[PDB]
Each structure stands twice: as structure tokens, then as C-alpha cells.
Design a protein around this nucleic acid. Sequence first.
DNA 1: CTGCGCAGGATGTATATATCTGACACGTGCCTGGAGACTAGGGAGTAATCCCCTTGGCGGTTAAAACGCGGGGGACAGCGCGTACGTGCGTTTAAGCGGTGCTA
DNA 2: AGCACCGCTTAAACGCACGTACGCGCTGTCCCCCGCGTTTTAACCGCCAAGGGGATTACTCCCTAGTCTCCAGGCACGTGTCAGATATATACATCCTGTGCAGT
Lengths: 105, 103, 93, 95, 97, 97, 83, 78
Amino acid sequence: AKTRSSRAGLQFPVGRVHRLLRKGNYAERVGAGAPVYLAAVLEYLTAEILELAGNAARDNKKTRIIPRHLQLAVRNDEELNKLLGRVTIAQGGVLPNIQSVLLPK
Amino acid sequence: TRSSRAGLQFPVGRVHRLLRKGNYAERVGAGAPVYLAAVLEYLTAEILELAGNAARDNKKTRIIPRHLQLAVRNDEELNKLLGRVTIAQGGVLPNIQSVLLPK
Amino acid sequence: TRKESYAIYVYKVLKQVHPDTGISSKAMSIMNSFVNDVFERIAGEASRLAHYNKRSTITSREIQTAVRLLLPGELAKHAVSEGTKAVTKYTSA
Amino acid sequence: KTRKESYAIYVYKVLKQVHPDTGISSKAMSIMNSFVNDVFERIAGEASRLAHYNKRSTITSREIQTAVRLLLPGELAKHAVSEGTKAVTKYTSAK
Amino acid sequence: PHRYRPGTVALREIRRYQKSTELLIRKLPFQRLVREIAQDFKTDLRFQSSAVMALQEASEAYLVALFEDTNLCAIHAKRVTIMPKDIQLARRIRGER
Amino acid sequence: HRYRPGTVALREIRRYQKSTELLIRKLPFQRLVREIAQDFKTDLRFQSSAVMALQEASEAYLVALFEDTNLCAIHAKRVTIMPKDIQLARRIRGERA
Amino acid sequence: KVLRDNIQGITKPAIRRLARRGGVKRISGLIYEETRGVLKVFLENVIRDAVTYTEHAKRKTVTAMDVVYALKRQGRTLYGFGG
Amino acid sequence: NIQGITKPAIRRLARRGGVKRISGLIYEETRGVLKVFLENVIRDAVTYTEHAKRKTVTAMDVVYALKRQGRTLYGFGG
DNA sequence: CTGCGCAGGATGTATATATCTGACACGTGCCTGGAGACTAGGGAGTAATCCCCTTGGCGGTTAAAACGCGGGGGACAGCGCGTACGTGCGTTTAAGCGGTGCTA
DNA sequence: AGCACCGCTTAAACGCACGTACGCGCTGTCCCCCGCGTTTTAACCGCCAAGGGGATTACTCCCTAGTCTCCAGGCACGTGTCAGATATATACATCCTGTGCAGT
């Protein structure tokens, strides 16, 4: 294979992640494993998220992942939710949670 | 130098080195080490100002960390700037909530 | 003009993971944001590590430890393994 | 015995410029040096993104300037731009 | 006739607005507001319609986050009704000014 | 004689806000630090400045925290801080969940 | 044409709707003005910054991107609009 | 060890904190709190040391950690 | 002759349908960013020496931690008053729609 | 593509009426903290001792920037259809209705 992506057996474009790291003034020089590693970690996470979004889409009987589905995904996962603990998703909405003391007895 | 040529006390050279080496951009203008060294100089003055004041107020010739803290937390604009900074040996401003006071 | 995007790679991975499932324009957009955010966050913190250690170059050792600061546990651990795997894979091939 | 740099001596000179008959402790000197480096990063950093954001390769006094306007509170910014624009023009005077 | 008891429609409305994602502030008012504030910073500014929409997305998120934490403060005080003083405690604690 | 309950409290507040000296004695703290780090890596050494740094950062943080805790106490018409306050403080800070 | 009092566009039923997605059941009457107060300090912050980017980009039009960069600056990162 | 963080020490911090009256359960709560704090900071710190290939955690690792966590500290080589 | 509980209505939500529309997802073709192959140069890694900083262990006074005692005032729970805020309806206002035109 | 400007449509907002149930002010009790005196631990300081590890130095070679030529991965562009939004009828749930039936 020609694509460095294939050499790494990755979906993400390792050539892109390589250009970016240079046109980005993070350091003089960039290693060759760093793009690879990063391009992969990017993939793990998009996968990790898309997984939970799809499930969210499924319960809501839907073919197509819309941001509510990403939002539900993110704030239901303790850990993803913390990675994006200071982030807003356009059209997210919030998690259904109503405080106890506001419920009738 | 260039500190001279700009009336600055702050090392205009040092600064130009640091910008180039600290990976902020490919190239680095001639004005910027000067503009910045100045802003750095400006702000260190405002602190040294109000701390010194505070050391006078607290009756000492030498500035200790506290005098910095007092200068900083009492200045509304400086305190914002250093809104997320803990200053070693700063202590706190004296502030006691009303309802806690005796009747 | 050319507006680059991770729209294809995100599709690819979605198809790998939920093959009967499509993404909306907005959703894509969001995804596309998330990749970029985590890119900088990682890349930046790696850059600090090079710097802190008087070092001129970001190697995957950096990108790794960057990851160990940025991500929470299970996420970090998996991501690390996932990452150092494709490097190993990449060297050999 | 390694030659570690700081801003110490310049902090002092400026101290004299404002409070001629006053001194400083080492402990507070560190704080002044920390303060300088922190502020230097924050401004430099902002400037850096500014360039990128605008598909441009150079950090000029202008970039620094607007960086300052994002980093600083209304009044402190105001004076800062002064001293900034001043020392620059005064610099471009001499040669 | 018929009359839902006090607090009954509140609970309903909460559930309504917690299921959806559509913006809660009306679109036009919102814009007028943003154009004002921006004018008073620099005259003669235009906006990408998506740039308003960004600020609103960002605005509502904040306020909903805010009410969340306000609400907690009401409840902290053995109360159920939110009050300016509640908001005020949330913002002091968030370290807003 | 006897000072009325709470009056040395006020007096102590005054004394500590006037001083900048550290309030946890170094060695227990130091031993706490080494313990916690051992759990992350074995056979480790600390610079004495590295321990001070931690100490300052931690105390300053806790004081700040009591400040905000204390406001919650007060928000609840109380005068005694209680764990339920800290939890609310931190919750709103977004430290705890 | 001149613009005046627009904060009162932020009607009471809306400041309500937000509070509901916020989990609030009972709303004190003195809340609606405090919210407008807050929303204003909020928009004044994002737009002061958005604008500073717009001025730097030497533009008369404020873009979705200037907004997004501002939010990121203020630690209120936003996905969905570029960046 | 943790209980080495004495009641009186915790009391002083709350005094400098502006606090007048302290419940008994606070003390222990404080401890969990302080623990969580150090952990996170020391986790990040050590990670810097592990990456610097050193058996000696420096002040700068600490300082870098506090920055990471948005609790910047001045006076140990900013 | 009276209080509590049961039944019953009407209200909103839930859902089923059919229905109409435009956005995603696809295929086609055109170009720019990555691949490929090569060089030359300096970073970093490694090994070889140094000394500084950290740990450690020891013993003296000395403050600080501990512990208990006793009673005061603050927490908390119960109650009741007074009223503000939720609800509903009729009245009123301007948002949202899509459609056209102009130049920044 | 941003602003402007217009009018057909109506969903939303406003304003007022009413009373319900919550904010808060009062009380009243019970105990959990504060004060303070004395009894118990280990913090601290000063002093020396030993070797780990970090700091500095000189050397070679692997790795990465830089450069060129070569071409399909990735983009915009176009297009056709089905997921999903919208409108409208209908069944299912409950919150509050007004009655009877239970007990004094």
C-alpha cells in the first residue's frame, strides 16, 4: 500500500495529520510516529463516540445521527462527558433530569 | 541595545529571542519584541507601584509576597487578570461576613 | 474553493461501526469540530512537553504522554494502546 | 554552575522608576518573575492563534496589540496599548 | 370548567423542554439585541446569519446551565422557588463577575 | 472568666487573615504527599521546593474553598459550615459531578 | 435606524422556557430582570471579543468563526459552526 | 497518614477561610477533598517526571501540573 | 347531617396514519496535497565524569495535638400567616414566512 | 449573502383575575460545637553522613527538513429518492372533577 494510513491500518489521513502538525508551530521538527499515533487516537475517539451516538439514534428509532444523539451520547458517558465538560453542542439540548423536591407526593 | 532605542527598561533582545524560539510563528516582526517588552514593562510597573504603596501602608521598606497579594486582590482590574493565580505566601484579604459579627 | 474536512474519515468509521446509519449535516459538522478540538488539545500539550524538556521535536512519545494528561482513564488507556499499536504496525510495514 | 536567566534586574530598575526608596525580597522576586513569564505566554499564545486564524505567518506588533486587547481588562489594556504604541514609535525613531 | 393545580404545568413544561433542542428565545428579538450591543462597541458592523445563531446557541446553553445551578441554590435553602439571590450565589461560586 | 462561644472564633479569623504562614505542619503533609505519589510511581524523590509548591497550592485552594463553602452555609440562613455546603460549592465550581 | 431597549425582546415566557429546560419549577418575579442583566454581561463579553477578532481580520462583517473563537477564549467552546 | 491532616490544622484553614462555626463531619469531608486535589495534581506532576525520565519530581513538574489544572502558582520558577 | 373516598370528564400526550418535501448520499470528473526518492545537516541518544541535592538517622526542648467537661446557642422541626406566582382567558402585538430587490 | 422592505398569517406575548400553596417569621427543644484547663505526642531544629541521581560534555549516526516530479485521494459539483417533518385523526393516561356512601 501507498497511503501511510494503510501502512498503519487506519481510517484517518496520516498525511493530513502530518501537514497540520507542521503548519501549526508546535515544534521545529515533527517525528514520524507522532502523526500516526495521533491520527489513530483521533480515530479511537470518533469511533468511541459514533458508537454511543448510533445507539442513541437507535433508541430514538432513527437512521440518522443528529446532534441530540451526540449530546445524549456524551453526557451519558461519565468519561466522554468530562473530556467535553466545557463544550457546547449546537442543538444538543439537555439530559432529562428533574430534581426530587419538585416532584408531587 | 534597543531597550534604549525604545526608552524601555525591559530587555528588548531577550524578548525577540523568546518569541522566535517558543514556537509562536514561522516569522517574527521587529516591532513586536518592542511592543510586548513594553506591555510587560508597563504591567510590572503597576504591580510594583501598588505593592510598594502597600509596603509603605504596612510600614516596611522591602516588598514581600503579601504586599503583592494585597496590591493584586485590592485592585479590581489586576485581580481579574490574575483571577486564576495563587500567589505563594499571599494570605487572604481580611473579610468577615456581616451575620458572623457580634450583635 | 476547497474546504477540507474529516467528513469522509468520519463516514468510514461510522460505517465500520453502525453500517445502517447516516449522519446529518449538523451532526457531521459537530463531529468535525470535535476532531479539531481534540487535535489542538493534544498537539498543544505535546508542544508544551517538547518545550519543557528543552526539546526541538514532537515524537509519538510526546503525543502519548500528552494523551495521558488530556484524557480520562479508560479513554486514555485504550487510546494509548490503540495508538502505540498503529505505530508498531507502521514501523514494520 | 549553570547560568539560569530571569527578569530580576529589570524588575528592580522598574521598581526604582516607581518607588526609588523601596526594596524587594527574593520570595517576592520569584513572584514578579513568575508573573512576567505567565503574562508573556498568555500574550504570545493569543498572538500565535491570531496569526493562524488569519492564515498569516508573522507575529507583528499589531498581532501583539490585539492579543493585549483580548487578554487585558478595559483600563489596563488601555494604558498597555499606549506604552506599546509609544515605545514602538520611539523605537522606529532611532536606528 | 377545569383547572390544573399550581406546579402541575411547570413539571409538564420542564419535561417538554427537556425532550427537545430547538431554541427558546425568539429569533428576531435575539438578533436586534446582539446588533445593539455590538453597535455600542463599534458602529457599522454586519453579521453572518450563522454568527448570530452561534451566539444564541452559546447564550441559551449558558443560561440553561445557569438555571440548573440557580435551581440547586434554591433547593439548598430549603426553597423550591428560584430568586435573584440564588443566581447571585451561583455566579459568585462559578467565579463570574 | 469565660469568653462567649464564637468570640475567639472571630478573633482567630482576624489573626489568620492577617498572616500568610502555612497552616498544616509540613511533615504530616509531606508524608501524605509521598504516600499519594507512591501509588503512581515507586522509588521517587521530591524536591523540597516541589513539596512547598504543592503545599501552597493546596492550602490556598482549601481556603478559597471554605470561603465559598461558608457562603453556602450563609445562603441557608446557617452559620455553621456542613459537608452539604462543600458538595454544593464544588458541584457548582464543576469540580465534583 | 436607531436601536433602543432591545434587551426587553428577551420576553418573560422565554426566560421561562430556558428555566424549564433548566429544571426550575418555581420562578420568583425578580428573576426576569436579573436574567436580562446576566445575559447582557454575557453577550457583552462574547461580542467584545468576537469584534476584536473582526477588527483584526480588518472586516466590516462578523463571521461565525469570530464568534466561535471568542467562546473558545472565554472557556465556552462551541461545536457546530466551524473550527 | 491522611488523618495526619489534623482537626486543628483544618480549623485554621477554615478560619483564614472566613468560617466561624464548624460541623464535626466537615473534617473528614475536607480530607477526601484534599486527597482528590493532590491526587490529580500529583498524577499530572508525576506524568511530567515519568516523561522527563527522572526519579526526582521537581517543582517545575508540580508548577506545570497546576497550570494544566487551572490553579497556576507563582514563586517556584514561573 | 357531614367528611372522605370513590367514581367520572376533559385535558394533554401519546401515537397511527398518510403525505409532501429537500437533504444526504452517490456517481463523475477534475486538481491539489501527498507520495516517492534523495541529500545534507544537526538533534538527540548514548556513554563517560561529576558533585549537588536528597535522604536519613539521631535526640532536646517546646509548641502543638489531644482529650475531656460543661453549658450555651444554633440547628432543625413544627406551625401558622400572608401573599406572590401559576394558571387560565381574552386581548394584543410582532415573529416567522418566503418573495423581491440592491450593493457592500 | 447580508440588509432592507412588505404583507399575509397566527403563534406567541401581554395583561388581568383569582386563590393556592409556598416564602418566611415565630417558636421551641435538644445537642452539637466552642471554650478552656490539663495530659499526651510528635513537629521541629540543629548536626552530620553517604550515595543516588541529575547535571554537564564530547561523539556519531539516525532521522527529519528541504527539495522535485509525479498522480490519485479528496473535493465540488450535479442529481435522484427516501428519511423525516408536517397535518390530521384517534386511542390511553391522569389530574381533578363532582358525585355517593360511609360513619358519627
